[PDB]
Every structure is written in C-alpha cells, then in structure tokens.
UniProtKB/Swiss-Prot annotation, chain A:
Effect of residue 293 to N: Loss of cleavage (both nicking and hairpin formation)
Mutant lacking the gene: phenotype: Mice display a severe combined immunodeficiency phenotype. The have a small lymphoid organs that do not contain mature B and T-lymphocytes. The arrest of B- and T-cell differentiation occurs at an early stage and correlates with the inability to perform V(D)J recombination. The frequency of homologous immunoglobulin pairing is much lower. No obvious neuroanatomical or behavioral abnormalities have been observed.
Organism (species): Mus musculus (Mouse)
Family: Belongs to the RAG1 family.
Compartment(s) of residence: Nucleus
Listed result of changing residue 298 to A/C: Impaired cleavage (both nicking and hairpin formation)
Protein name: V(D)J recombination-activating protein 1
Entire-sequence positions represented here: 408 to 758 of 1040
Complex formation: Homodimer. Component of the RAG complex composed of core components RAG1 and RAG2, and associated component HMGB1 or HMGB2. Interacts with DCAF1, leading to recruitment of the CUL4A-RBX1-DDB1-DCAF1/VPRBP complex to ubiquitinate proteins and limit error-prone repair during V(D)J recombination.
Gene: Rag1
From Swiss-Prot, chain C:
PTM sites of type N6-acetyllysine: 26-27, 37
Record-annotated DNA-binding residue ranges: 1-55
Subunit structure: Interacts (fully reduced HMGB1) with CXCL12; probably in a 1:2 ratio involving two molecules of CXCL12, each interacting with one HMG box of HMGB1; inhibited by glycyrrhizin. Associates with the TLR4:LY96 receptor complex. Component of the RAG complex composed of core components RAG1 and RAG2, and associated component HMGB1 or HMGB2. Interacts (in cytoplasm upon starvation) with BECN1; inhibits the interaction of BECN1 and BCL2 leading to promotion of autophagy. Interacts with KPNA1; involved in nuclear import. Interacts with SREBF1, TLR2, TLR4, TLR9, PTPRZ1, APEX1, FEN1, POLB, TERT. (Microbial infection) Interacts with adenovirus protein pVII; this interaction immobilizes HMGB1 on chromatin, thus preventing its release from cell and subsequent inflammation activation.
Modified residues (Cysteine sulfonic acid (-SO3H)): 8
Effect of substituting residue 45 to E: In gastric-carcinoma cell line
Domains as described in the record: HMG box 2 mediates pro-inflammatory cytokine-stimulating activity and binding to TLR4. However, not involved in mediating immunogenic activity in the context of apoptosis-induced immune tolerance.
Shown residues within the full chain: 99 to 159 of 215
Positions bearing Phosphoserine: 2
Family per record: Belongs to the HMGB family.
Annotated protein name in UniProt: High mobility group protein B1
Effect of mutating residue 8 to S: Inhibits oxidation-dependent inactivation of immunostimmulatory activity in apoptotic cells
Length: 343, 589, 55
DNA sequence: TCTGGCCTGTCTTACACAGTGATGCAAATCAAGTGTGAAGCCAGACAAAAACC
DNA sequence: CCTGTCTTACACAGTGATACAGCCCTTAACAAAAACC
DNA sequence: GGTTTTTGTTAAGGGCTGTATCACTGTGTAAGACAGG
C-alpha cells in the first residue's frame, strides 16, 4: 500500500496540513457510511472520541430489575462482559445494592409539621413487619399469614423523590420556576386487590398507591405540574403492603391494614416538608381510595355481599326500585353514613 | 473534522474520486479494506487502533448468544437490554437480535457439510438437516394408534458433526499439546456415551424423556499409539450431555418409547459401519465412532434390554444370578449378559422350542421375557456401592446390639428397641440424625471407623469389636476403588487387592456374622462384591436437575404452541451444551 | 490524598536533595506511621465531600 | 369356592439439594509524584521463503 | 324466592420468528448562508 | 460588496435498522348457571 500512501501524503500536504490521522479516519467513516454500514462507523467514532461506555450503577440496577435477572445471573453476565472486553461496562453487585438503597423508602429525610399523630418520626424506616406487632403466641388468635409493608409516609417520600425529575421538568414546561417551593398538592390513589392464587405446585393481597397528579399553588390558580400518563399500569401502582391472606378473611385483613389506615388518616392532617433540588418544599396530600373493585368496596365499607337487593354501593336503591326507576338516583352513601348505619 | 457529513464529502470528493480510481485499478473495489489499512497505518504512525479494529468494546455475536442463552433472557428482554445499553453509552456493546440468530445457525445441527464413506445405511445423505420431527413420520390418522406425544430430535450423525465442530478449538489445541502437527488427519477415534432418562414430571400447573450423547474422549493414531487429544473433564455435567431427542412421553410407555427411539438406533447402528470425513481447520479429517450406552439407570436398562422389572428374581443386569444365588455365592460371578444373548433368549421365550412349562422356560431364558431393542453397557455408580454396604452395616449394628449371635430369636418389639437404641446413641455421640429411608450422604457419614468405635461402646463382647473393626477396615480398603476417577493411577494397590478383600469380606460375613443371612440381597451389594473389578476393566471407572432445565426453557424461552415449544426447548438446550459458548462464559480464567 | 500521599509529596524535596538519582520517603513514612498526619486527613475529608457534591 | 400368607406393583412419605439475596473478609485498586525502560513503527533499494507459468 | 359456591368459559400475556416502515446513501448539478478581504 | 467554504436541496430506489406483528396457547379471572337451604 506504500504507493497510495505516498499519493495520500501528497494530497494531504497539498491543502490539509499533515494531520493524516483525521483525514484517513474521515475517509474511512464516509466510505463505511456509503456501504450503508452505519453501526461499525459509529462504534469507530466512539472509540476515536474515547467516550467511556460505563453504565452508572443505577442503570445496571434498572436493567436487572426490569429483566427479572437474579443476582447470580447478573453476576455471570457482568463478569463475562468485563472479562471479554476488558472494560467494566456493567457494575458489580455491591454497587447495585448501594444504588438500590437510594430508590427504596427510608433513605431521604423529611419532616411533618405538625408531627404526625401516632406515627414515629424516624425517617430511616424501611421494610416493616406487616403484622405490626400482632400477637402470635399460642394463646392468642393463630397467625397464619406473612406480610411486609412500608411505613406509608416513608413510601410517599421515596416515591416523590423518585419522580423529582418529572416534577421539576413539569414546572419548567408550565413556565414555572425550578426552585419555587409553594404548597404542592399530591392526589394519591389507593388500591387494594387480592391476587387470586399464588401457590406454586394460597392467596395474596396487594395494598398500593398511585401518584395521580401534583399541582402547585401559584396565585389563585392550581397549575398542574404533573399528571400520571398511564394511571392503571403496573408501572406506577406502587406497592405498599404485600400479604399472604384471603381478601375474604376479614380478621387478618383488618389486622394488617388498620396500621396503614391510621398512618393515612394522620397524614391527612399535616404538611410534609421535604428537600428537593436543594430547596425545601411543602406537600399536602389528598387520599382517594378508588382502586377497590365492587366486592372489596362492599367488604370494607360494611355493605352486604353483591347478591343482595341493595345493588348500588353509591345509593340506597333496591334491585326492584332501580329496575322501576331507571334514571333518577343520586350518590348518597358515604363512609360516615355507613359507620352511622352500622351503629 | 469540525465539518459535517455533506461538508466532509464535498471537501474531499476530488481525493475520493482519485482513490476510487486507484482502487479499481488493482485493489478490486474493497475500498473499506484499503481505508482500514490506511487509517491503521496512520494511527500507528502517530491502542485506539486495536480497539477500532475490534469494533474489544464490541462483543462478538456468539458472545451475546452465550450471555443471552446462559442467563435465560427472553428475546424481548434481551432487546430491551440491548437498546437501553446502546442508547445510554452511545455504543453498540451488545449485538442486535438478528446477529444472535445468525450466530445461532452456526452452533446448531445442519450447518456444516460432511460425508460418510460409505454412505450411512438407511440414512438420508442431506447435510442441511436440523431439527426434525421426533415421531419420525409416525402415523397420526384416527384409525391408527393414538399419538399422545410430541417430540423433536436431531439426526444423530448431524448432531455428532455439530458437536465436533463445536469442540474443534479444543481438538486442535490438544493435538498441539501432545507435540503433534495441527494439519495431521490420521483416523481420530471418538468414544461417545449414550444416555437416556425420564425427566419425571414436567407439568406446569406430563413426563418427558431425554435422549442424549456425551463426547467422552477423542484419540488419534500416531504410530502404534493412541494419543488422547481430548477427554471430557466433567463427564456427568449437564454442560456436556448434548440433547438429541426431547419427547413428551412416559419412559414406561414402551410403544411410544420404541416408536420414537428406533429411528435414532438405526442411525447409530449405521454409523458403526463407517468413517466420517469432515473439514476442520482447512484440513479434511477422518473420524471413527465407538458408541457406549452407559447413561441408563437400572429401570431403563431392564426395559430396553427385554429383562423383567426390578422386583424380579434375576437381580443382576450383568449376570444370570438369582437373589437367592447371589446371597449364597457372594463374590464369584462373571459378567455374562450381552445384547445379543438377550435377543437370543427372547427368541427362545417366544418360540419355546423345548416345549416347557412357563416356570421352566423363564428359568431357561433367565428373565429375558421381552425383545431387547437397545444395546446398552449396564453399569453401577459409586453411590450405590456405599449405599448397599451401609444398609448391611446398619442392620449388622442393630443385630450386634441385641446379641443375635448369642440369641437366635427376637420379637419385632425387641428389634425396634434395638434400632431405637442405635438411633439414639448415634444422634447422641455422632450427631447423625436418624433416617427412615436410606440415602447417599448417610452412607457416606456412617461408613467410618469412628462410628465403629461408637457402636462398640454398646457391644459387650470385644471379640465382636474385633469382628466389626475388621469388617469396616475391609470396607475402607475397597472404597477407594469404586469411588476414585481412575483407580488404575490413583490407587493401584487397592484395585489389585479388591478381589482378595471382597473374598475375605464375604468369608467374614459367612463365618462371624452367620445371623445376617436371610436369603435376600440388593442389586447394589451383589454388583459391589462381584462385578466391581470387571466393570473397572470394562469402563476404567465407577465414580436431579435436568427436569428443572427442561421446565425453565419451556417457560421463558419457548413459543407457547405444542409443535414449536419442543423444538424451541431443544434448540436452547443444544446452545446451552455448546462448549464454544461456555468458553466465553469462562473468559475471566 | 492519603495521609502518606500528602506526606510523600511534602518530603520528596528533602529525599531528592539528599539523593538526586521515593524509597527514602517511603521508609520514613513507614517507620514513623508504625510509631501528626492529622492535616492530611482534614484535607482528604474536605476534598471527599467536594467530589461528593460534584454530580 | 374359601382364609391365609406370599407376590408384583402402585402408592407414599422422605430427604438432598439447587439457587435466592445478603454477608463478610481477603485481595486488589486507585491516586499524586518521577527516574527508568520498552514494543512497535519511520524510509528505499533490493532479495529470499513460499507458490503461479 | 334467595345467598352463595362451584362450575366452565373466554381474553390475554408474552414466546421466537418475521413482515414492514424508514432514514441514510449514491449520481450530478444547482444555490443559499457564511465568512474572510 | 467579492470570494471561498459549508451546507442544503432535488429525485428514485436501495440497505441495514428497530418494531409492530405474527400465530399461538395456558392460565387467571369472573360470569353465571345452578346448588343448597
Ligand atoms: Mn378483586
Ligand atoms: Mn430414571
Ligand atoms: Zn345507584
Ligand atoms: Zn451379577
């Protein structure tokens, strides 16, 4: 190739100035593109620019969690890629565990003003026993269930921090300020369902919340700075309590959920101050328990089973009445009326 | 270089036309290569060059297949990973799915060409043959016998071809390692293990049979010497048991088993009479095959060699003894069964040429009451030797605690109290939990001299302490033989003396342990006392997951349809067993 | 920088002037650390949290 | 035909063990410095180890 | 006529393989923006 | 304002790319006929 080498040195000294490295790289890249072979060209470009292909521990955590890879399987892939390219593209398992600590409840500090009634002020609280200290001695009622849950507030903290990037970008997109700290309001959807049979060859219940929308108070206007795009996707139904129990076993259901209802009730009466992007912000919460199918609504709002003549969970009608009177009914039931009527 | 693409193109277009001319003149128009040489020479003139050539920093598609198959990633999951890593580092670290499929074509049967001289009898000569229907054209009309199974298989020879090409790198490097020439093409000899087992229940809420072959060793003929250029290091690993036929059927369903397996037996029998020529490293090589069917547990051997079920009186699959005979004559038996003898004896049974009663006939044909259809090499494994010995020692311990050598008669209560005594004492002094059913590691832990000391702490007479210590010493003198991987090299004196030690063992049992004869004896004991040396000279050696493998592939890597799921599982299993990929998963070494 | 790293940077002048053609500062740091390096840990904590702020 | 003990066989309880995320300690590793060396590349006329008439 | 429990039924989640939508590239020949004097 | 580079356009089709799409079942869920009081 010496002859074309001397000819190219001539052409380069003619006008280019002798940095052949670059001109031979450009000639070869443009030839590769001419052969519609873009991939190899881009890889050469990245290797000549030297931009490092190292995935931050959080990206590896994302990939492992979203492809259901076990620690052992992820470790084999990690070690094999590292060994064969010599470069540590994926991070080792401990870096992932440490990146997980950030995304889980209990990592960030916060405060409640005023302090939450009957809720611990500790902020390092993580996974907690779902039984919430339920007596398990042979004398007391038998406990046949296992359950794990978060502290409801701790979960709300971690979730808000998880969508911090979307909150800031939504304020920007509404022409509002990044560091503005006015009273944000979060509408929180509560969901509960039994997951049917879980046995491998036994039922489960999932108590969850979805962050529905976050508004800010700017004047006498409530500017919508975030709204959940896919409100019924498993991607944003955030789990709060997982229990192995039957949605029809009333005793265990109330024993496991009452702690959560107390925490929630206590958060209805306070404002959460939490540090985002350097700026302390305040959050008010609106809890709307809407993610209850008919059967679970009737069980947890003291109504009769769905076969009864009292067909509406929203009104006092009877099957016969609602068949004779088609249209004219108003929404009249409410948690308070129902508590009263039990009395 | 700060310029854009149309700019760089226009600013260099004159040199571009000049170089295209210069390339068409003599190079032939592979401008890519001349520019690669130009840029590499430029880079050297001024590390980055080596990585550019590698694109190091780009994983070869076979490495991506290895990672993907070996981590059980679905295609969709693999793609999400690929696109996310690419999008975040800007570089194409993993290759896209079509590259993995294209690399998959190479490692699967049907890709490389070969020839059989002479051509294999009753086997098609096409070499592009991959996964084929395992029923092998079995009639499926409603009139015919009902087909409740689905099966997919390779053509046996095609599979062996793919296997040898998968291990080419190891074969060449083994020839180098033996001080031989890479290009030597003399007659290689491949010793191949055949294995068959049922994988129990596969149901997700249905049994399967797995027919496989393992490459055991490859020797070359260089002079009057057979030079071992390859030997499987881990012969009992799922990593090298290569799948050949997967069927959804019961190993006890003789009709479906024979219908699905007879085609494979025909292909193997025809490979017994030929030489495979196959091109490795540029040089055509010749291969002869020796098929040894050893991966058959007792039940499948008795089924495929026309013998009776395991409850029979003819306990040995290797000899004509009876349970009563093998309990009276402990040691002196030779291996006398062979596939041909069994075929003959079936014909004798079916024709009954001397007009005998059914009892007399069964005695004549020694329990061969069905027609064999697979020639096997039935053996035993290190496990069952320890097991048979432990069961006998445990019963001896019980009966030495009750002094049966002194008291002939005992009620069932007295025997249960002896066993309870021994169980409590072993729990107390040895920290061995009592077990209600025999098992491997229990045997492993009980057959020690320390436990003999412990149990002697419960026996009054010390002459029987001497008896037990000697008996266990003989057990420990024999054990290395059946447990080692190569007794010839690892304990030659133990092996030389094995026959003598088992003779003295049986004589001890027959003199100082008269009470422990009741006319019964186990397959494992009889084999352990009578056939261990002959088996070592036949095979060289003696020394629960396959179901999970099948299930996992079925769930996470298989189209959910009855005719493709089987071949999707078979393809993934083959990819899993390919050494070429396992080497990438052992790169860090 | 480690305590010993700031130490070695500070006393490369002495060992180089004494001997013009690492090992001597290595030894001295050795035998005196087995036996006042507090400001090196101070600076290390400062630079550590500074890099921590760096996102 | 009929109760009793042996028989092939289908059922049962049993017990190792495969793998999970977490754990904990050993061993790299990284980071500034500064005196070294080192494996491959630089040009041009021209002739051998390795293959075409 | 009922409250309620079992029954079978019917969409749908995802498997690997595969058709489909598509921006980049080629020829040559122009011209608008840009940037130095 | 001139003059050179940088960048863009036009067209008609081609090529690797990323993706919606394919056919395809088992499986969980819930409609609901029916059982039991
Ligand atoms: Mn429900
Ligand atoms: Mn078996
Ligand atoms: Zn209503
Ligand atoms: Zn025998």
């Amino acid at each position: 190739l010496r002859e074309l080498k001397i000819q190219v040195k001539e052409f380069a000294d003619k006008e280019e100035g002798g940095d052949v490295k670059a001109v031979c790289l450009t000639l070869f890249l443009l030839a590769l593109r001419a052969r519609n072979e873009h991939r190899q060209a881009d890889e050469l470009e990245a290797i000549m620019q030297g931009r490092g292909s190292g995935l931050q521990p959080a990206v590896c955590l994302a990939i492992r969690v979203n492809t259901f890879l076990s620690c052992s399987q992820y470790h084999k892939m990690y070690r094999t890629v590292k060994a064969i390219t010599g470069r540590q593209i994926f991070q080792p398992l401990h870096a992932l565990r440490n990146a997980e600590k950030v995304l889980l409840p209990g990592y960030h500090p916060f405060e409640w003003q005023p302090p939450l009634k009957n809720v611990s002020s500790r902020t390092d609280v993580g996974i907690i026993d779902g039984l919430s200290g339920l007596a398990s001695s042979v004398d007391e009622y038998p406990v046949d269930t296992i359950a794990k849950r978060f502290r409801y507030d701790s979960a709300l903290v971690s979730a808000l921090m998880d969508m911090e990037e979307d909150i800031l970008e939504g304020m920007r997109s509404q022409d509002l300020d990044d560091y503005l700290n006015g009273p944000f309001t979060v509408v929180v959807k509560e969901s509960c369902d039994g997951m049917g049979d879980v046995s491998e060859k036994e039922k489960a219940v999932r108590f969850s919340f979805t962050v529905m929308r976050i508004t800010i108070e700017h004047g006498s206007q409530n500017v919508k700075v975030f709204e959940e795009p896919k409100p019924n996707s498993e991607l944003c139904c955030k789990p709060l309590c997982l229990m192995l129990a039957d949605e029809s076993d009333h005793e265990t259901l109330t024993a496991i959920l009452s702690p959560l209802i107390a925490e929630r009730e206590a958060m209805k009466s306070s404002e959460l101050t939490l540090e985002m992007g350097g700026i302390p912000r305040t959050f008010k919460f609106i809890f709307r328990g809407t993610g209850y199918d008919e059967k679970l609504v009737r069980e947890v709002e003291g109504l009769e089973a769905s076969g009864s003549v009292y067909i509406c969970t929203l009104c006092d009608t009877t099957r016969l009445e609602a068949s004779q009177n088609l249209v004219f009914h108003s929404i009249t039931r409410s948690h308070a009326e129902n508590l009263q009527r039990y009395e | 270089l700060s310029l854009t693409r149309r700019a760089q193109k226009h600013r260099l277009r004159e040199l571009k036309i000049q170089v295209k001319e210069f390339a068409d003149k003599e190079e032939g128009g592979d401008v890519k290569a001349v520019c690669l040489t130009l840029f590499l020479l430029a880079l050297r003139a001024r590390r980055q060059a080596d990585e550019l050539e590698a694109i190091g920093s780009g994983l070869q598609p076979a490495v991506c297949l290895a990672i993907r198959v070996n981590t059980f990633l679905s295609c969709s999951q693999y793609h999400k990973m690929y696109r996310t890593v690419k999008a975040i580092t800007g570089r194409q670290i993993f290759q896209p799915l079509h590259a993995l499929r294209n690399a998959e074509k190479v490692l699967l049967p049907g890709y490389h060409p070969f020839e059989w001289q002479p051509p294999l009898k009753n086997v098609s000569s096409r070499t592009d043959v991959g996964i084929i229907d395992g029923l092998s054209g079995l009639a499926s009309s409603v009139d015919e016998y009902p087909v409740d199974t689905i099966a997919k298989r390779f053509r046996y020879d095609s599979a062996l071809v793919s296997a040898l090409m998968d291990m080419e790198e190891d074969i060449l490097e083994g020839m180098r390692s033996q001080d031989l020439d890479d290009y030597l093409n003399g007659p290689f000899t491949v010793v191949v293990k055949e294995s068959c087992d049922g994988m129990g229940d596969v149901s997700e809420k249905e049994k399967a049979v797995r027919f496989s072959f393992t490459v055991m060793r490859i020797t070359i003929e260089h002079g009057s010497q057979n030079v071992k250029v390859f030997e499987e290091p881990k012969p009992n690993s799922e990593l090298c048991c290569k799948p050949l036929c997967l069927m959804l059927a019961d190993e006890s369903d003789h009709e479906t088993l024979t219908a699905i397996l007879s085609p494979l037996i025909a292909e193997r029998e025809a490979m017994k009479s030929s030489e495979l020529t196959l091109e490795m490293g540029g040089i055509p090589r010749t291969f002869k095959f020796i098929f040894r069917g050893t991966g058959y547990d007792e039940k499948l051997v008795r089924e495929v060699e026309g013998l009776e079920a395991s409850g029979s009186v003819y306990i040995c699959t290797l000899c004509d003894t009876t349970r009563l005979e093998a309990s009276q004559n402990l040691v002196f038996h030779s291996i006398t069964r062979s596939h041909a003898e069994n075929l003959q004896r079936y014909e004798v049974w079916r024709s009954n040429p001397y007009h005998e009663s059914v009892e007399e006939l069964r005695d004549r044909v020694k329990g061969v009451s069905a027609k064999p259809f697979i020639e096997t090499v039935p053996s035993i494994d290190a496990l069952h030797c320890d097991i048979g010995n432990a069961a006998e020692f445990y019963k001896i311990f019980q009966l030495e605690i009750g002094e049966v050598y002194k008291h002939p008669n005992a009620s069932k209560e007295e025997r249960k109290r002896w066993q309870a005594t021994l169980d409590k004492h072993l729990r107390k002094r040895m920290n061995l939990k009592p077990i209600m059913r025999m098992n491997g590691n229990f045997a492993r832990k009980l057959m020690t001299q320390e436990t003999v000391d412990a149990v002697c702490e419960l026996i009054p007479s010390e002459e029987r302490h001497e008896a037990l210590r000697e008996l266990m010493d003989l057990y420990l003198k024999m054990k290395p033989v059946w447990r080692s991987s190569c007794p010839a090299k690892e304990c030659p004196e133990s092996l030389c003396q094995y026959s003598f030690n088992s003779q003295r063992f049986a004589e001890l049992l027959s003199t100082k342990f008269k009470y422990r004869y009741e006319g019964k004896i186990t397959n494992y004991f009889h084999k352990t006392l009578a056939h261990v040396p002959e088996i070592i000279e036949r095979d060289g050696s003696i020394g629960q997951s396959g179901n999970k493998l099948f299930r996992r592939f079925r769930k996470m890597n298989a189209r959910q349809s009855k005719c493709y799921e089987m071949e999707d599982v078979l393809k993934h299993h083959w990819l899993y067993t390919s050494k070429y990929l396992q080497k990438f998963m052992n790169a860090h070494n | 920088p480690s305590a010993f790293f700031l130490f070695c940077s500070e006393y490369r002048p002495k060992i180089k002037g004494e001997h013009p053609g690492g090992d001597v500062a290595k030894k001295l740091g050795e035998m005196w650390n087995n036996t006042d390096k507090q400001p090196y840990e101070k600076k290390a904590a400062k630079l550590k949290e500074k890099y921590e702020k760096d996102i």
